[PDB]
Symmetry: D2
Subunit: 244 residues, 4 copies
């Protein structure tokens, strides 16, 4: 009975520092293999991104403390307002519930968008999740800038890579050697001149990723954007509730 | 890069080496979940079969899991003390387990309840926590703790719902009858007042579920519904749980 | 080496970057300690001067310390938010501060109380804890918290010991006399029964002690681009600026904080 | 008061995992410079080590949870029994108390051993202190082995270095360049063949360090949840009033030394 419950004293809770912005980032586990197994289109599978986006928006609509979400590829980052008391700011609760939620929402929406690709039990969509604290909103701006810069680099690379492979019939291995050394202008030239692709004409979602933001009128409703957030300061300034 | 410094704000937790790790998952809002999908009360057999299939599948994927114990909407997994899965990072281990149990549950649900398709607002989610134990006797006491808790809670729920269904008590009147009572009292209340013999309840409901890796010439996963609190020989004949 | 793996069991705690750090040290068993060396009651001036000398000395050695507040057997130190002392290691920051205050206290004690050599079973020990605050408004409220506490404990102790020393009550009956009492009552007890006006007590006893780094020609001149020899000059001025001591209200006087912008930066 | 006390909620305590061995290691801050300022004898200053040993033994006689201590140079490691509840196993409390205790005990004993070299305010003996958890006693064995091997390595280097400088009248740079590359056996010969010094003739304390142990005579091992209340208190009494013995011996390779002291494991 009560002779075993002392083992409860070995648990250690981690209460995240109060009045600090929390970022929760989730990223698909082994999604390179996952995207091969389910034959994702390359470089970008549109419906696969729409599954991520439905999952993230659904989560965000469940927790009014999530003010802003940014996603691309197999990742999503969620901004929690600094006065968030969700699960008393317990790190274990916030992170394992977020990876659990994204996982199950992903499975739900996958069966909707891909009815002909039923999930195999050895290839279920799993996510990790980590919480990071940022004490000042300038780090929050820089964080999302970090994630959008990364979206740019990876999409430009992948779009070039997969066009070398699919249009020029290169194998993945010869595509990589072709790109070693190349800078951004080079990849652009290769896409236009060799593959007949104008990179600037790629979908805004592929190039910029996806922003889900909570909108307030008399400072709520969820709106989705595919825009620059790195250099457009007015985008943030007209949204002061992201900071409060 | 001018933005990547933000990575330096991340803080990892590497769990103390050479210590046993328990990962415990527990269903999020499973009161509501069990009502929405019209689970049988006090215990739903097929729901438990879904948990057990999920846990067995996870365990068959991760050779570091030596033992699992489940009852109700929870499961505990023992990782061997020299486990190096994700370099023993707490963030990785716990979010992987909550993600794994969640999706395995969704997968197995559709096998066991083809007639109860999952609703977008009622998916099976789990939390997950890691606990360190520096000595195997604490691992023994840990699984004893969970099994005793299975007993206490199964007794409570079985008694409560039979007071309501057999004696036609209201929820408050049943709660009022149970105030103060200890386990032997609840067992007696069931027999004498509700006409239910608790000892005849299913062993799974009473004892919970143990999944253990069996080695012969010290592998196979075997499922048990047996006492592990007082049977020292059950543990003693399985030294690989310690090692 | 076959034994050095044991180093891997150590766990460092690097305090979150860009946040204010408060270190609070507090004397271990200073009730018993102040009895053993027969401190004057309610306040021993020279014992407080020993604490203030220790804190001023520590602060003169570590330019990241921007502000210190003390009373009784405690001192709190504000580290600027971009402090990199020991790479923000919690273990290093706290045990250094408890060690420093302990040794500075023993040194200054032998200067101020040459006739009371310290006994080996009653050495002055301090704990020390680091606390993070993500916004400067929390730093203001933190120091308000400590100054409100200084007021409360000093009003109680002054009433208590005047009941004992002037009215010849035993400690326990003085304690019972004060059970239930609120602030105006303690004030009345002191005035009407003991002939002491609490408002006439020393500012140091009532308000505590503030040690602040003072800068003269300060502009928030710091940004990531400016570097090299400019930064060394900013660092040099922080070392060779003057520590001023105050016994003033810092709870409600915003202009005191407002005219000292380098505390936030 | 009530509107400001919320700031208390930002504090984060670290409760060290129950029932695991705790090692607290303290090491003197900047004792290289400290040893030069007060003109420590080189390679080893006997009275300086005696100040450390007195400090450690006094601490150890004050805290019955400390079962074993090992010191050499400017460091000491203290072993806490597994069931130690000193300050509820709070890491902030355990560590800042130890760095504080060692610092003040050192200052105290220094004035006993060095009455003519009073401590200067810019050269006080300060210590850091860290707590480390070890879940199995074999790691405790290896920890103290680790520290004694380190003691051997540093004493041998320092003995060779200072004999080259002080006897052979070498400059610091060449003594240092002379030792680059050398292993223990090389150092042993430079001392013997070139300095006429037999390293084994050095004091055992310098070579082996200092072990301080709590000794029990009529010890039987039983430690359990069942025994409680005042029963725990006599075991506390036995532990508080037990003898501290000092040794300067190998503990790396001597299994019988440990096996005959089973109370260290509890
Ligand atoms: N402080 C405690 N002391 C002893 N037992 C506890 C304590 N808190 C919870 N328990 C028990 O431990 C078991 C594990 O459940 P769990 O830890 O999820 O409790 P909970 O209240 O849901 O807490 P959490 O918020 O951590 O999920 C429960 O049966 C519960 O009764
Ligand atoms: N919508 C998509 N369309 C096409 N490919 C995708 C899509 N989403 C993900 N991928 C593939 O999944 C990969 C995710 O890369 P990531 O850096 O997360 O590695 P990972 O395989 O998920 O490994 P990890 O377990 O370390 O996260 C991408 O490189 C791409 O190969
Ligand atoms: N040490 C680092 N410094 C800067 N950026 C990094 C570092 N490690 C990873 N990144 C980048 O951070 C982004 C987030 O990836 P993530 O945090 O999942 O890292 P990872 O390398 O997969 O490690 P893990 O998932 O094991 O923590 C990725 O774009 C990755 O390229
Ligand atoms: N197999 C099952 N049959 C019947 N009921 C079940 C079953 N599994 C779970 N439940 C119901 O779900 C509840 C889960 O209890 P728990 O204390 O975990 O509450 P919860 O709603 O899941 O809250 P939390 O989110 O804090 O875990 C049980 O008390 C029971 O009512
Ligand atoms: N990364 C490491 N790996 C193995 N041994 C180390 C390492 N760092 C230090 N040591 C050794 O550990 C012993 C204890 O020294 P200590 O723990 O004080 O570390 P340190 O290097 O002084 O750094 P700090 O005191 O800042 O943690 C010393 O003998 C040192 O040589
Ligand atoms: N300058 C002084 N004059 C007279 N007495 C003092 C002075 N400074 C400290 N004291 C005594 O020391 C006490 C310090 O109180 P505190 O609340 O820190 O308790 P403590 O005995 O130090 O216990 P702890 O170990 O929890 O800090 C005061 O109550 C006061 O009696
Ligand atoms: N839980 C609490 N909430 C608010 N104030 C507290 C709390 N505990 C202590 N305090 C107050 O905080 C001030 C600082 O004292 P300190 O931080 O040393 O705490 P303590 O109660 O002595 O416990 P410890 O020093 O062991 O952490 C004192 O005024 C004390 O009365
Ligand atoms: N008893 C002693 N006799 C002679 N020299 C000593 C003695 N104790 C300490 N020292 C000197 O103090 C030094 C302590 O070495 P340690 O590695 O701790 O460096 P430190 O200068 O104290 O730096 P840190 O602050 O990182 O500890 C030794 O190298 C030696 O020079
Ligand atoms: Mg990753
Ligand atoms: Mg991934
Ligand atoms: Mg990714
Ligand atoms: Mg729970
Ligand atoms: Mg649950
Ligand atoms: Mg539960
Ligand atoms: Mg205290
Ligand atoms: Mg005190
Ligand atoms: Mg105090
Ligand atoms: Mg060191
Ligand atoms: Mg040192
Ligand atoms: Mg040293």
């Amino acid at each position: 009975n009560s002779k075993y419950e002392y083992v409860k004293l070995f648990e250690k809770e981690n209460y995240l520092l109060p009045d600090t912005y929390i970022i929760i980032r989730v990223d698909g586990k082994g999604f390179h293999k996952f995207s091969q197994f389910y034959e994702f289109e390359k470089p970008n599978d549109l419906k696969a991104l729409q599954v991520m986006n439905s999952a993230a928006e659904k989560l965000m609509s469940k927790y009014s403390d999530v003010m802003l979400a940014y996603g691309d590829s197999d990742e999503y980052s969620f901004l929690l307002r600094k006065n968030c008391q969700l699960y008393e700011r317990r790190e274990m609760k916030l992170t394992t519930l977020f990876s659990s939620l994204m996982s199950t929402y992903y499975m739900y929406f996958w069966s909707q968008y891909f009815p002909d690709k039923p999930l195999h039990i050895d290839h279920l969509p799993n996510f990790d999740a980590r919480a990071v604290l940022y004490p000042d909103f300038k780090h929050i701006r820089n964080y999302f800038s970090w994630r959008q810069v990364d979206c740019h680099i990876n999409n430009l690379y992948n779009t070039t890579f997969w066009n070398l492979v699919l249009k020029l019939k290169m194998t993945p291995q010869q595509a990589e050697q072709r790109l070693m050394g190349t800078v951004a202008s080079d990849k652009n030239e290769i896409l236009f001149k060799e593959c007949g692709v104008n990179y600037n004409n790629e979908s805004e979602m592929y190039k910029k990723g996806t922003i889900i933001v909570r909108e307030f009128e008399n400072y709520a409703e969820l709106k989705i954007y595919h825009v620059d957030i790195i250099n457009d300061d007015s985008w943030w300034k007209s949204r002061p509730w992201l900071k409060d």
